[PDB]
Amino acid sequence: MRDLKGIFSALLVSFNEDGTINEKGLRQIIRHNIDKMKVDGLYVGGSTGENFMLSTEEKKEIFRIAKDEAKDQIALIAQVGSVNLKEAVELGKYATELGYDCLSAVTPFYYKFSFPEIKHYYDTIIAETGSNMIVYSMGIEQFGELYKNPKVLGVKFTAGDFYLLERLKKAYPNHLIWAGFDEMMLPAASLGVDGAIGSTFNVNGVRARQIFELTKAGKLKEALEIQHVTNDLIEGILANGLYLTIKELLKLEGVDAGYCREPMTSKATAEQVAKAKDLKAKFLS
Amino acid sequence: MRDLKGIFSALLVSFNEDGTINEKGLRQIIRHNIDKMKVDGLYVGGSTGENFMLSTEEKKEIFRIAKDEAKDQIALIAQVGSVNLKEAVELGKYATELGYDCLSAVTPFYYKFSFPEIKHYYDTIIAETGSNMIVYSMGIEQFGELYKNPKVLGVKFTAGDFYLLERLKKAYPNHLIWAGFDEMMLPAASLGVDGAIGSTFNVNGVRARQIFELTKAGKLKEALEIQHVTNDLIEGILANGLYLTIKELLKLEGVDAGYCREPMTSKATAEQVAKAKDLKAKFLS
Amino acid sequence: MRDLKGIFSALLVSFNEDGTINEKGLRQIIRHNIDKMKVDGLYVGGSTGENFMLSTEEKKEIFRIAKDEAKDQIALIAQVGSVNLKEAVELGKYATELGYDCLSAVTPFYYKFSFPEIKHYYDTIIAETGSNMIVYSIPFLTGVNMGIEQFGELYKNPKVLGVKFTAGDFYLLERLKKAYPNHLIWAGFDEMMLPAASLGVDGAIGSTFNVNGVRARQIFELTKAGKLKEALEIQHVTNDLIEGILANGLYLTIKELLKLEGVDAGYCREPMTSKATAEQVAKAKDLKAKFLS
Amino acid sequence: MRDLKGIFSALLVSFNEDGTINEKGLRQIIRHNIDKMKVDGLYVGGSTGENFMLSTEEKKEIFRIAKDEAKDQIALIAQVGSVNLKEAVELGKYATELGYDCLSAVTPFYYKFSFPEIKHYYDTIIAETGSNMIVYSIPFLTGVNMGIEQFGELYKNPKVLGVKFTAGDFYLLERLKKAYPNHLIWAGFDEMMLPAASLGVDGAIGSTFNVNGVRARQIFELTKAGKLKEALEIQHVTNDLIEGILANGLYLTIKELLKLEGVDAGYCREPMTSKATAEQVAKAKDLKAKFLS
Ligand SMILES: *[C@H](CC(O)(O)[C@@H](NC(C)=O)[C@@H](O)[C@H](O)[C@H](O)CO)C(=O)O
Ligand SMILES: *[C@H](CC(O)(O)[C@@H](NC(C)=O)[C@@H](O)[C@H](O)[C@H](O)CO)C(=O)O
Ligand SMILES: *[C@H](CC(=O)[C@@H](NC(C)=O)[C@@H](O)[C@H](O)[C@H](O)CO)C(=O)O
Ligand SMILES: *[C@H](CC(=O)[C@@H](NC(C)=O)[C@@H](O)[C@H](O)[C@H](O)CO)C(=O)O
Ligand SMILES: [Cl-]
Ligand SMILES: [Cl-]
């Protein structure tokens, strides 16, 4: 398959006031990432896409739109995880059918699952779809058990545990790791992660790529300067409301990024809009 | 509406080997609770029913079967909560249509929601269905905000916080509380909870009722004796695997309680079956 | 042995402005507990006594003062636990020499001690002093969570009599009484006295009994007689008081409440804030008027 | 001021079988660090020194011994924090009198101190001694989490120079360097030295540097020169060693590794298990053969 290393934006979705998908806005978000953020790929249907508040049919519509808009211009990963394994298989089969380059799946949540249940969940998605898989963050022995399946490619690493990150890269050198924390891209890159999947790349993809590339070249003081500016921006984004602020920043770039999906607050308050305007002036102008 | 105080079993669902609903087995589980466990009601579609691993259509089939089998013999509460608010509304409307006595909804999960988002979620389910609501476990000021909606009846209390339980009963005396922890029924009843919703009542409903009634009469030494035997049983159930052990115990009573739903381990190992046989001999014979 | 069941105040200590012990004030706190609060005994050197911010010599002084003032009128338990096991042994020997009825010790904290290390700590304090022991479990401050099997191992030592229980885990509490029915349990959460009494605890050790011991005894005795409605009413009033005490600052508010009774309860010890603000004082007076008048 | 940047071993202390300090052994540990580990300095009286299980007088003895043995060859930092603020002041004055270059103090623990109380604690130690201060942050043991605004308040005192950072939060670490670029940071997690060095920490204070100081300096200096591939290789070998040390028992394994070098590192202090088992000794020898040979 296609090269999956590098910078992947976790695709945000544009929603209408009524909560339905705004297709025109979603396609503008996709075009912004490919053409302006210059991402290596998109991670579709993840947490950042407000995926878990949606129906199976809405998830399928998003997978269709993103693949139709992106075509073969960039790599595409489809997050199909769920508490419902039959739904994960159904979404995995559909994304595979659409031509996604690989699948990914959050560990099943809501209930507490044992490690064997989690491994069976990943092995079943893989067996039923025929597609390769990127897991989510478990310790070194458990990653080894997951990696016994040759179709598990690696992990979207979110644990804030850089000792575990080092251990994983040492023990499983041929498996890939994508950093899942945009605000810790530098230290993750210092340990040799293969790429990053993140929500903030939808608007800060230029700096993210710079950090990643400068860090791999050993230009740590300059990379740190860019991580500092990036984190000032991320700090403002987190305080103001993560998905709504990224969408409001996209609107300032002429992208119809729309509303958030309920039960998340759907409409940005005037204060949230004002803060996004300030953040754009300070960090993205 | 119908009296909702007392003992409610959180209904377990029988599944076939392939994960589909075993309707004949589900109806036997329902009949066992009404006719033998002598419950005051059933709480359908909750955590114990393996609800969160199911499709919207499977949840509807379970709501239909339970209401058709129970008819008007007992009170019926329908848990319709989800990370998807549109799905919660759709399930709430269907359960209301079937004649369920009231709805209930877990707080939206997977994402971290603010209190205002959680209140909006409950107010929306109520507004769109016209049904009363039982919330899930937040502090005293937040319960007060939820209780501003006159259609919020009370809470299925799971927090292991008996100071908060006392505060809630004092501050909101006309709102109901159902204990959600079977192993702490006595102390909850000592503080005046109005009933209990629990998974273990599917097989230990006689002792549960005895504990509740003895405790309300102030017969605490005898209630404690029955809670001790109950908790020896619960301890064995938890160690062996909660839903599978209750199902295996039901099979020993001639109830086709079936398999669990994947991603949970679906089939009981021989060791799990042996332990259930031992538990039945010691506590339910 | 001198009976250890019932109502025990976790003794508060009066400090001067400079942090030294105010002996006169401490004796007034003790008298107030014995004579007005009608306690069965005092738990001296616990968390409520500001014990872990003090020197070994200060701890010995408080032990001497409390035994000299109380004499033989009440039961006395001495909390001597610490991260320093040699200090715990030193304090346990001294409290034993003074005539304390039993020792108690918090699980060793700061470092992440294994269960075997925790068990060796209790066995050493007992062996070196010859005194009985009450395990002091307070997971919220120590981070130490011991399960039912671990209590069993501790109870293999016949001089371990029971536990001062503060976990907010009533399942574990029930399991302790099921497994070790003859071992004692003292509830450590005053705001949850009713439900703990419903599960058969043998007494209670608490900070709010320094000012609310009358109500605390009522809740305990009414619950044991099965008078739940009456007990719950007194727990409700108690918990309005406790809610206010907690919001205003626990240590300082109980001392200010005691000062309004004529007890020189003094200042708190630094690094805790030593002096109450005007707002804290005003709130203490309002709480006294409403609940202890 | 005497430069405080670089590699600092958190000094381990040699104890006799009865728990008393083994002075000869402690001097050998110090010599080993200065002469073979080539440290820039020692952090004395920290968690690794088994400090919180000791008496004030034992702490003073370790401070005297370390300064007398090291003389002026290296930088010396004295950790004097405690739940007892009067003890921290007493120890800070004594370490200042002995000539320690700077003081350090763990956030006060056990009780849930507010931020203002924590800030008053640092300001008091500084004011009463006249010495500079390094905040010691170790949320995993204390449960105290301070955010960026709180560090700012602490840094309002110009004698607070920086922090010994152990949180497993590299976002916070980056925020500290962004906001207070001239304030110092010492990484406190030896297994995460590379990524912390990528974020510009000024040095490292760690327990494994007592035996792995050569590799630790390499990782630090290679990372600062941007030689990531080389640094990562040495971090990999280091982390195989650390993984084994952690699994076998951290304190005891480092002491056993030191004994294999001819250093009388002694026993651990009780309530920690004092003697290594035969299996722990055998594993220490295997780790030495593989990684420190
Ligand atoms: C024991 C007394 C105590 O630990 O039980 C107190 N603990 C706490 C949590 O502070 C207890 O009385 C509380 O003060 C009270 O319930 C209010 O929360 C001792 O001091 O050693
Ligand atoms: C400071 C040294 C330290 O706190 O940084 C040590 N801390 C811990 C978590 O034990 C550190 O060196 C570790 O020992 C090491 O990274 C292995 O986990 C001090 O002792 O005060
Ligand atoms: C992957 C998402 C992802 O990595 C984000 N995770 C969270 C908790 O938000 C991450 O990019 C985050 O938004 C930023 O680091 C800001 O904290 C996915 O499935 O979307
Ligand atoms: C309500 C369920 C419920 O109260 C159970 N909760 C959990 C965590 O299992 C409870 O009955 C539990 O099974 C027993 O107390 C045993 O611990 C629902 O929605 O099902
Ligand atoms: Cl590999
Ligand atoms: Cl009410």
Side-chain angles (χ1 to χ4, degrees), chain D residues 122-135:
Chain D
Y122 288 110
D123 293 341
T124 302
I125 293 161
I126 296 164
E128 298 293 314
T129 62
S131 285
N132 294 321
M133 169 65 68
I134 292 160
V135 170

Side-chain angles (χ1 to χ4, degrees), chain A residues 10-14 26 29 48-50 199 202 243 246-247 250:
Chain A
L11 184 64
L12 289 150
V13 172
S14 176
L26 175 51
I29 289 168
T48 305
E50 283 173 274
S199 65
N202 285 270
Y243 307 141
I246 301 172
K247 295 185 186 191
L250 285 161

Side-chain angles (χ1 to χ4, degrees), chain C residues 84-104:
Chain C
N84 184 345
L85 173 60
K86 296 195 180 215
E87 184 192 26
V89 167
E90 180 181 355
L91 297 170
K93 292 174 172 282
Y94 184 70
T96 302
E97 284 286 312
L98 277 173
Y100 275 82
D101 298 295
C102 193
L103 301 181
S104 189

Side-chain angles (χ1 to χ4, degrees), chain B residues 171-175:
Chain B
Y172 308 103
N174 307 299
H175 281 80

Side-chain angles (χ1 to χ4, degrees), chain D residues 149-288:
Chain D
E149 191 243 290
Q150 286 174 338
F151 279 98
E153 277 284 348
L154 294 177
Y155 297 169
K156 282 179 187 171
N157 190 329
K159 295 187 60 71
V160 176
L161 306 184
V163 59
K164 170 186 177 196
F165 194 89
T166 76
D169 186 350
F170 284 64
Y171 177 33
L172 177 61
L173 186 49
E174 180 278 330
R175 297 279 79 195
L176 276 167
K177 271 301 168 181
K178 159 70 212 313
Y180 314 104
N182 302 313
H183 277 72
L184 304 168
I185 303 176
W186 294 261
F189 24 60
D190 312 8
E191 54 274 69
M192 301 196 293
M193 175 181 249
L194 196 162
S198 81
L199 289 171
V201 301
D202 303 280
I205 293 162
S207 61
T208 71
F209 314 153
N210 284 272
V211 294
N212 199 45
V214 172
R215 278 193 194 91
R217 175 172 300 283
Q218 294 170 335
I219 295 163
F220 190 70
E221 292 175 1
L222 287 162
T223 306
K224 305 280 249 172
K227 307 185 163 184
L228 291 183
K229 178 181 209 69
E230 282 180 69
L232 178 59
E233 218 33 53
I234 299 169
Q235 185 80 69
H236 284 330
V237 175
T238 289
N239 283 4
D240 282 356
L241 174 54
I242 293 175
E243 177 180 280
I245 287 172
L246 293 168
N248 201 226
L250 174 76
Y251 291 82
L252 283 173
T253 305
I254 304 174
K255 296 187 186 192
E256 182 51 41
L257 287 170
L258 289 168
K259 289 174 194 189
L260 303 171
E261 325 222 357
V263 174
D264 183 8
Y267 290 73
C268 275
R269 170 61 176 244
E270 302 279 356
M272 286 206 189
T273 303
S274 58
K275 181 176 163 74
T277 59
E279 314 89 283
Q280 282 175 305
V281 171
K283 186 172 191 211
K285 288 163 176 180
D286 183 69
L287 293 167
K288 172 164 186 64

Side-chain angles (χ1 to χ4, degrees), chain C residues 124-136:
Chain C
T124 302
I125 293 161
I126 296 164
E128 298 293 314
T129 62
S131 285
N132 294 321
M133 169 65 68
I134 292 160
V135 170
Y136 174 19

